[PDB]
Amino acid sequence: KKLREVLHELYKHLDSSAASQQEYYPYVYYKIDC
Amino acid sequence: GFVAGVINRERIPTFERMLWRVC
């Protein structure tokens, strides 16, 4: 969660303009599990 | 050519942001 905020800081400037986020992130994400 | 919609400024911010993120 802290990483969600920090990576928000490190990836918001990719778009530089604005950025609910939902799965609309400024990064391309998927999950891997058991 | 490029088809142009018409909306009444009801919910343009959220809708257009959703368009920008979806595709």
From Swiss-Prot, chain A:
Bridged cysteine pairs (disulfide): none
Tissue-by-tissue expression: Ubiquitous. Abundant in brain, liver, kidney and testis.
Cellular localisation: Cytoplasmic vesicle, Secretory vesicle, Synaptic vesicle membrane; Cytoplasmic vesicle, Clathrin-coated vesicle membrane
Function according to Swiss-Prot or TrEMBL: Subunit of the V1 complex of vacuolar(H+)-ATPase (V-ATPase), a multisubunit enzyme composed of a peripheral complex (V1) that hydrolyzes ATP and a membrane integral complex (V0) that translocates protons. V-ATPase is responsible for acidifying and maintaining the pH of intracellular compartments and in some cell types, is targeted to the plasma membrane, where it is responsible for acidifying the extracellular environment. Subunit C is necessary for the assembly of the catalytic sector of the enzyme and is likely to have a specific function in its catalytic activity.
Quaternary structure (record): V-ATPase is a heteromultimeric enzyme made up of two complexes: the ATP-hydrolytic V1 complex and the proton translocation V0 complex. The V1 complex consists of three catalytic AB heterodimers that form a heterohexamer, three peripheral stalks each consisting of EG heterodimers, one central rotor including subunits D and F, and the regulatory subunits C and H. The proton translocation complex V0 consists of the proton transport subunit a, a ring of proteolipid subunits c9c'', rotary subunit d, subunits e and f, and the accessory subunits ATP6AP1/Ac45 and ATP6AP2/PRR.
Family, similarity comment: Belongs to the V-ATPase C subunit family.
Protein name in the entry: V-type proton ATPase subunit C 1
UniProt organism field: Mus musculus (Mouse)
Gene name of the record: Atp6v1c1
Part of the intact protein present: 329 to 376 of 382
Curated annotation (Swiss-Prot), chain B:
Entry superkingdom: Eukaryota
Consequence of gene loss (knockout): Embryonic lethal. Knockout embryos die at 5 to 6 dpc, before gastrulation.
Subcellular localization(s) per the UniProt record: Cytoplasmic vesicle, Clathrin-coated vesicle membrane; Cytoplasmic vesicle, Secretory vesicle, Synaptic vesicle membrane; Melanosome
Tissues in which the protein is found: Predominantly expressed in neurons in the cortex and in the dentate gyrus, CA1 and CA3 regions of the hippocampus (at protein level). Expressed at lower levels in astrocytes, oligodendrocytes and microglia (at protein level). In the cerebellum, present in Purkinje and granule cells (at protein level).
Oligomeric form and interacting partners: V-ATPase is a heteromultimeric enzyme made up of two complexes: the ATP-hydrolytic V1 complex and the proton translocation V0 complex. The V1 complex consists of three catalytic AB heterodimers that form a heterohexamer, three peripheral stalks each consisting of EG heterodimers, one central rotor including subunits D and F, and the regulatory subunits C and H. The proton translocation complex V0 consists of the proton transport subunit a, a ring of proteolipid subunits c9c'', rotary subunit d, subunits e and f, and the accessory subunits ATP6AP1/Ac45 and ATP6AP2/PRR. Interacts with SPAAR.
Family indicated by similarity: Belongs to the V-ATPase 116 kDa subunit family.
Function summary: Subunit of the V0 complex of vacuolar(H+)-ATPase (V-ATPase), a multisubunit enzyme composed of a peripheral complex (V1) that hydrolyzes ATP and a membrane integral complex (V0) that translocates protons. V-ATPase is responsible for the acidification of various organelles, such as lysosomes, endosomes, the trans-Golgi network, and secretory granules, including synaptic vesicles. In certain cell types, can be exported to the plasma membrane, where it is involved in the acidification of the extracellular environment. Required for assembly and activity of the vacuolar ATPase.
Protein's UniProt name: V-type proton ATPase 116 kDa subunit a 1
Species of the source: Mus musculus (Mouse)
